[PDB]
Scaffold this active site. Sequence first.
Site, PDB file in Angstrom:
ATOM      1  N   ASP A 108       0.737  -1.196   0.050  1.00 36.06           N
ATOM      2  CA  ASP A 108       0.031  -0.186   0.152  1.00 36.06           C
ATOM      3  C   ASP A 108       1.062   1.224  -0.197  1.00 36.06           C
ATOM      4  O   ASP A 108       0.708   2.174  -0.832  1.00 36.06           O
ATOM      5  CB  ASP A 108      -0.918   0.036   1.291  1.00 36.06           C
ATOM      6  CG  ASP A 108      -1.919   1.166   1.225  1.00 36.06           C
ATOM      7  OD1 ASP A 108      -1.080   2.470   1.439  1.00 36.06           O
ATOM      8  OD2 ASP A 108      -3.031   1.211   1.171  1.00 36.06           O
ATOM      9  N   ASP A 110       3.746   1.648  -0.763  1.00 34.79           N
ATOM     10  CA  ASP A 110       4.536   1.970  -2.103  1.00 34.79           C
ATOM     11  C   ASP A 110       3.779   2.454  -3.092  1.00 34.79           C
ATOM     12  O   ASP A 110       4.326   3.385  -3.736  1.00 34.79           O
ATOM     13  CB  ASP A 110       5.183   0.445  -2.735  1.00 34.79           C
ATOM     14  CG  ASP A 110       6.043   0.538  -3.801  1.00 34.79           C
ATOM     15  OD1 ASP A 110       6.048   1.554  -4.333  1.00 34.79           O
ATOM     16  OD2 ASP A 110       6.816  -0.177  -3.864  1.00 34.79           O
ATOM     17  N   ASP A 188       7.557   0.003  -7.260  1.00 32.84           N
ATOM     18  CA  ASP A 188       9.015   0.376  -7.319  1.00 32.84           C
ATOM     19  C   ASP A 188       9.860   0.806  -6.360  1.00 32.84           C
ATOM     20  O   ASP A 188      10.783   1.033  -6.533  1.00 32.84           O
ATOM     21  CB  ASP A 188       8.949   1.854  -8.373  1.00 32.84           C
ATOM     22  CG  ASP A 188       8.272   3.030  -7.753  1.00 32.84           C
ATOM     23  OD1 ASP A 188       7.892   2.877  -6.582  1.00 32.84           O
ATOM     24  OD2 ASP A 188       8.481   4.153  -8.179  1.00 32.84           O
ATOM     25  N   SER A 190       9.552   2.527  -4.182  1.00 29.99           N
ATOM     26  CA  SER A 190       9.475   4.213  -3.809  1.00 29.99           C
ATOM     27  C   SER A 190       9.580   4.342  -2.292  1.00 29.99           C
ATOM     28  O   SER A 190      10.150   5.169  -1.387  1.00 29.99           O
ATOM     29  CB  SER A 190       8.249   4.934  -4.446  1.00 29.99           C
ATOM     30  OG  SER A 190       7.275   4.616  -4.211  1.00 29.99           O
ATOM     31  N   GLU A 258       4.733   4.169  11.717  1.00 33.17           N
ATOM     32  CA  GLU A 258       3.508   4.202  12.449  1.00 33.17           C
ATOM     33  C   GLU A 258       3.427   2.918  13.071  1.00 33.17           C
ATOM     34  O   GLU A 258       2.938   3.232  14.491  1.00 33.17           O
ATOM     35  CB  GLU A 258       2.378   4.244  11.176  1.00 33.17           C
ATOM     36  CG  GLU A 258       1.033   3.988  11.628  1.00 33.17           C
ATOM     37  CD  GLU A 258       0.664   2.731  11.868  1.00 33.17           C
ATOM     38  OE1 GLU A 258       1.334   1.728  11.302  1.00 33.17           O
ATOM     39  OE2 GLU A 258      -0.623   2.352  11.976  1.00 33.17           O
TER      40      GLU A 258
HETATM   41  C1  HEM Z   1      -1.194  -1.520  12.742  1.00 30.77           C
HETATM   42  C2  HEM Z   1      -1.507  -1.425  11.153  1.00 30.77           C
HETATM   43  C3  HEM Z   1      -2.009  -0.247  10.574  1.00 30.77           C
HETATM   44  C4  HEM Z   1      -1.851   1.185  11.116  1.00 30.77           C
HETATM   45  C5  HEM Z   1      -1.789   1.361  12.492  1.00 30.77           C
HETATM   46  C6  HEM Z   1      -2.763   1.892   9.937  1.00 30.77           C
HETATM   47  C7  HEM Z   1      -2.899   3.140   9.997  1.00 30.77           C
HETATM   48  C8  HEM Z   1      -3.319   4.158   9.143  1.00 30.77           C
HETATM   49  C9  HEM Z   1      -3.449   5.475   9.049  1.00 30.77           C
HETATM   50  C10 HEM Z   1      -3.616   6.377  10.320  1.00 30.77           C
HETATM   51  C11 HEM Z   1      -3.875   5.849   7.707  1.00 30.77           C
HETATM   52  C12 HEM Z   1      -4.130   7.122   7.580  1.00 30.77           C
HETATM   53  C13 HEM Z   1      -5.958   7.292   7.537  1.00 30.77           C
HETATM   54  C14 HEM Z   1      -6.239   8.614   7.078  1.00 30.77           C
HETATM   55  O1  HEM Z   1      -5.858   9.593   7.267  1.00 30.77           O
HETATM   56  O2  HEM Z   1      -7.202   8.741   6.082  1.00 30.77           O
HETATM   57  C15 HEM Z   1      -3.857   4.631   7.050  1.00 30.77           C
HETATM   58  C16 HEM Z   1      -4.040   4.581   5.841  1.00 30.77           C
HETATM   59  C17 HEM Z   1      -4.222   3.584   4.984  1.00 30.77           C
HETATM   60  N1  HEM Z   1      -3.980   2.248   5.429  1.00 30.77           N
HETATM   61 FE1  HEM Z   1      -3.609   1.681   7.076  1.00 30.77          FE
HETATM   62  N2  HEM Z   1      -2.764   1.172   9.058  1.00 30.77           N
HETATM   63  C18 HEM Z   1      -2.411  -0.102   9.142  1.00 30.77           C
HETATM   64  C19 HEM Z   1      -2.375  -1.125   8.570  1.00 30.77           C
HETATM   65  C20 HEM Z   1      -2.756  -1.306   7.175  1.00 30.77           C
HETATM   66  C21 HEM Z   1      -2.758  -2.501   6.319  1.00 30.77           C
HETATM   67  C22 HEM Z   1      -2.407  -3.751   6.823  1.00 30.77           C
HETATM   68  C23 HEM Z   1      -2.975  -2.063   5.026  1.00 30.77           C
HETATM   69  C24 HEM Z   1      -3.061  -2.891   3.782  1.00 30.77           C
HETATM   70  C25 HEM Z   1      -3.184  -4.216   3.675  1.00 30.77           C
HETATM   71  C26 HEM Z   1      -3.313  -0.828   5.255  1.00 30.77           C
HETATM   72  C27 HEM Z   1      -3.847   0.068   4.099  1.00 30.77           C
HETATM   73  C28 HEM Z   1      -3.979   1.576   4.257  1.00 30.77           C
HETATM   74  C29 HEM Z   1      -4.302   2.328   3.170  1.00 30.77           C
HETATM   75  C30 HEM Z   1      -4.038   1.916   1.615  1.00 30.77           C
HETATM   76  C31 HEM Z   1      -4.226   3.690   3.552  1.00 30.77           C
HETATM   77  C32 HEM Z   1      -4.571   4.927   2.632  1.00 30.77           C
HETATM   78  C33 HEM Z   1      -3.054   5.324   2.392  1.00 30.77           C
HETATM   79  C34 HEM Z   1      -3.223   6.575   1.663  1.00 30.77           C
HETATM   80  O3  HEM Z   1      -3.424   6.597   0.353  1.00 30.77           O
HETATM   81  O4  HEM Z   1      -2.943   7.963   2.236  1.00 30.77           O
HETATM   82  N3  HEM Z   1      -3.138  -0.146   6.249  1.00 30.77           N
HETATM   83  N4  HEM Z   1      -3.724   3.680   7.747  1.00 30.77           N
HETATM   84 CA   LIG Z   2       5.573   3.447  -5.718  1.00 29.27          CA
END
Ligand code: HEM
Ligand SMILES: [Ca+2]
EC number: 1.11.1.7
Length: 595
Positions: A108, A110, A188, A190, A258
Amino acid sequence: SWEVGCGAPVPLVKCDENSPYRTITGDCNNRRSPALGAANRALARWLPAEYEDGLAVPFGWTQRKTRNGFRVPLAREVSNKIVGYLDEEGVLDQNRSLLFMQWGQIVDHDLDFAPETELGSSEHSKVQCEEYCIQGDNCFPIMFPKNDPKLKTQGKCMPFFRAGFVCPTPPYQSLARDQINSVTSFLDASLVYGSEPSLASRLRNLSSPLGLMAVNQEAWDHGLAYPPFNNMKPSPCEFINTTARVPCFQAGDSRASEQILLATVHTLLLREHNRLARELKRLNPHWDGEKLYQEARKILGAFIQIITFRDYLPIVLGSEMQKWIPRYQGYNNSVDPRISNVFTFAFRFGHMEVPSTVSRLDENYQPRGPEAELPLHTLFFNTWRIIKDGGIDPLVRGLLAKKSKLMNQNKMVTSELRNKLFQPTHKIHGFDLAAINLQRCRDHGMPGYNSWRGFCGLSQPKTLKGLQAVLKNKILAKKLLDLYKTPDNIDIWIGGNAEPMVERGRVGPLLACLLGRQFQQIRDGDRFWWENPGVFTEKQRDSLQKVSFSRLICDNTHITKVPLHAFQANNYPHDFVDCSAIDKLDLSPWASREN
Ligand code: HEM
Ligand SMILES: [Ca+2]
Ligand SMILES: *[C@@H]1O[C@H](CO)[C@@H](O)[C@H](O)[C@H]1NC(C)=O
Ligand SMILES: *[C@@H]1O[C@H](CO)[C@@H](O)[C@H](O)[C@H]1NC(C)=O
């Protein structure tokens, strides 16, 4: 007049046409349209943004304004009523290791980032938002419902700030409001090297002209590297233990720290690079600094592509895998390799794969130390438990020998994230990743559940019974229709995630479709796909085909017993084998035959 482009900022592009390397900014991947899939450009819109005012204001902004004749439920209420659960027994995934979860987050990171508006510097408005809870320009605070425990202890709202958007923050954006993807859309690596030249350069050991990535000069892990510290005050990793004062790590992606296990996997990736540049020197002693760097970088980007596409995506998509990601047929220049806005929500399915505890294991895979397993929440922005307790080796064993949370319609997101999330500059372990995700959908002008079902050639329920049939859950359906009134209004995130998992996969059909297209597109639209004819030599690609997460662990830790298949649930010692039975990456094809 015709809005050819909205990008006044970041005009700089020089496309070396003969360049054998991706750029750091992912510019010049596509030739006809060189900005496609590059960092600092707008997220792609597969469907038109749905805003309150059809431009920028999110649904839920104005009290008296409806979606389709109904008010949108509060984020936190949807969170409380649907997403939360008490009982952590039964929730673990019998066939997915905790690594499964982890890699999702790596991949993600990346692919996408849409950071907040950074507008409140020399401005109290980021605290005015915080403790006064006043809905401002880019302040969009998450209000607690009337029966909420957090009302009693922790104010009236959880703070929130809208994501950044192109043609900067202050005036009305041309057309609709579109959010920025601040990293490169290509798989990539990144997150290891950076997406801007500034970070890219600051991350390297340019002092040693051996093309190595700069490491930590303050602490080590049994003779193996750590990521360098990011010394920028304030440091949230400092904030969590003031006594330890161990700052967050420094990586090609901001969010590396994080949580401890992501920092951990970031540490493996960095190591593999150094390990690859040190070897490249031996085979090619004539190569300059950057050639070693660049040539190791491509090996690593390729590595991430293989693990993701060969090992990860099949166990995410299962049956739907072949329907969306047919086997490779080469680069297509007409593909749009940009990450869609909706993907950055589709991929939040991971949030429900995260369990409430993390363990440290010893060489016997036993509880390492007295306080072996810890609550996930105490590990947000915690680097000290790496440096001062045990290194990454015990953590990596946990990732192998423990299970991801299984997603569950009645148990969606652990309290560790739902109620106890730590966010920089906000002091308390007191936030909700679920509520945040829902508010973000609106912030980003997301179409609703049915729009997305239509988009994927699936049915669009209108009635409670229709929804019941789709979700295969009477009660879940009932709770949703009580909140959203119509499925047309269900926030995509909760709507996609509510769907039962397709056969042999971990997401429902809607997510399988959404994820599928995106990961199909970033493969096909990538001029430097590892398996693209020409990127690598035949001899190289047969060496590459053998990479394994098993091997990455062996090469870059002191862990000498691993599974063959690191994403399956694997139990010691039954499914563990020595590091001597596992295919290395042969680096011999990279020897240049000069004279
Ligand atoms: C302990 C594990 C994790 C924590 C603490 C965490 C926490 C967060 C936080 C705080 C955000 C920002 C949310 C926002 O401001 O809108 C976020 C976004 C995201 N998380 Fe998680 N996450 C975790 C695990 C995962 C996992 C396992 C995945 C995917 C399999 C994932 C995928 C995403 C994605 C795709 C975003 C959006 C990123 C973006 O484009 O800004 N996360 N996560
Ligand atoms: Ca990338
Ligand atoms: C902070 O770190 C020290 C070791 O550096 C440890 O013994 C102590 O428990 C930690 N305190 C907290 C509250 O995390
Ligand atoms: C390339 O992409 C387009 C649309 O993205 C697709 O319809 C077409 O089949 C592809 N063409 C080739 C040459 O594979």
